[PDB]
Amino acid sequence: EVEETLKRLQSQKGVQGIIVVNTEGIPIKSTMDNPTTTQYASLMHSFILKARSTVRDIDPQNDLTFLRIRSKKNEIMVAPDKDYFLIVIQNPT
Amino acid sequence: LTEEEKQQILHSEEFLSFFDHSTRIVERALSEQINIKLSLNRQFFDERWSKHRVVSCLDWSSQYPELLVASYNNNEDAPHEPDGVALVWNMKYKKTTPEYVFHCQSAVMSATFAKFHPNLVVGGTYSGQIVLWDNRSNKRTPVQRTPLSAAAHTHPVYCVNVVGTQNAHNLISISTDGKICSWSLDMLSHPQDSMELVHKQSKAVAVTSMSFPVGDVNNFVVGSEEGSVYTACRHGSKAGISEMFEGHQGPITGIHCHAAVGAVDFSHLFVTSSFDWTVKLWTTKNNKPLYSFEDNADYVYDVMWSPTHPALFACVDGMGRLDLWNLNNDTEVPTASISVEGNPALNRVRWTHSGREIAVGDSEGQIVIYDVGEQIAVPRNDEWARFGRTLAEI
């Protein structure tokens, strides 16, 4: 399913915007607008590829299955396994 | 840059914000959640180096609890084949062959790991020379060999070990003649300290067993071939035999002090194994053996305490069965007792330093690794109190 998944992931905290990204970056889906979704998701994909390289540097068999950034102004969530790259925009709290 | 200005910048007092940040991240990261019986354990039997060649002694490495040294002494199938072979067998991975193989010209019959050197194996042989084996070298011949002088051991030697702190070690070894001697683990060309054990004038001791108490190194207990156990002080004015014990009318085939710590001390207690199936749970403080467990027609060959259980210990038997006596559970029947196939004469038992597994010797060289149930292996907090109460019974 698609719509039910997005609805349940959004309504759990009233998330500002989430799209499903089953491909390596460059997603065509949108939740508030095309640019802020697509370009930022591609940048997230690049940075999580770098983070995967970082976690493989210490030991190659390690993989990053969970990642969250909670700064003073936003919270970003992504749980990549092989191609499932999640995006969450949320207040820091 | 270099590691000097970092010291002054740390001593610099702009660290209030850094401390606040550290406290905040630690307090936020405090919460943690999740994302989503006696058994034959293993076997160890060489064929090239274990055709007959009965097992003599075993040990576990303190630094590497996965390592065990075997010692096969007798050579009768062929004079040309190796006389004494020492085999080290690993626990981490299962192999049909020992991890390393060692040879001595004479018949190796007592061996132990080295505490100071984590890559060295020392063993005693039938000739009475102390035999070294540095695993770094690729040669099967002994690395360092003590001379066969009257100063050193000239009779067969059974008890060899290294004790003391990491910065203070002494290679205590005693032969059948009754002589004790210490060595430095790096230099064994000369005996650093040696004197023969002797009781009341003109009475030598036919030494065949020894065990240092946990912690203490200055005093210990020695098992004699004449069935009479003695306590000796390693160093001091009273260096020598200090206790006459009736023991048993059978030669002592093993001895061990208490091997548990954490509650009320029991190190004064010790276990002796005679030649007539008479194990004596018994303390050095007392002169009377506290109990004299008797059964069977055969007899023990070794007795070893549990490194973790203050009540359980293992026993050897000649017809191939290994029994466990948990005194708190019972004092009349072995708590666990099973027999290995082929009813062979087991000769050595050595508890793993973890205490979760027990190794046993054999009359044919096939080392059998035995695992025990969890309920019988780990003691409890009340186990020590129950052990004290049972000792207080008589």
């Binding site: - | 008797e294 059964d295 069977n296 009349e332 029947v333």
Partner: protein, 48 residues
């Protein structure tokens, strides 16, 4: 019975004793039955 001095009190105590020994012999029968059904193995320790 206690500090009672009457010898008829002693006879009543004797009746109490024979009833006590009736229970004692019942216990004897119980422990001997538990004995024999556990016997026949061998001579050593818990067996005999």
């Amino acid at each position: 019975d206690g500090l009672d001095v009457s010898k008829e009190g002693t006879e009543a105590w004797e009746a109490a004793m024979k009833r006590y020994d009736e229970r004692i012999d019942r216990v004897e029968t119980r422990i001997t039955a538990r004995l024999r059904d556990q016997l026949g193995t061998a001579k050593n320790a818990n067996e005999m």
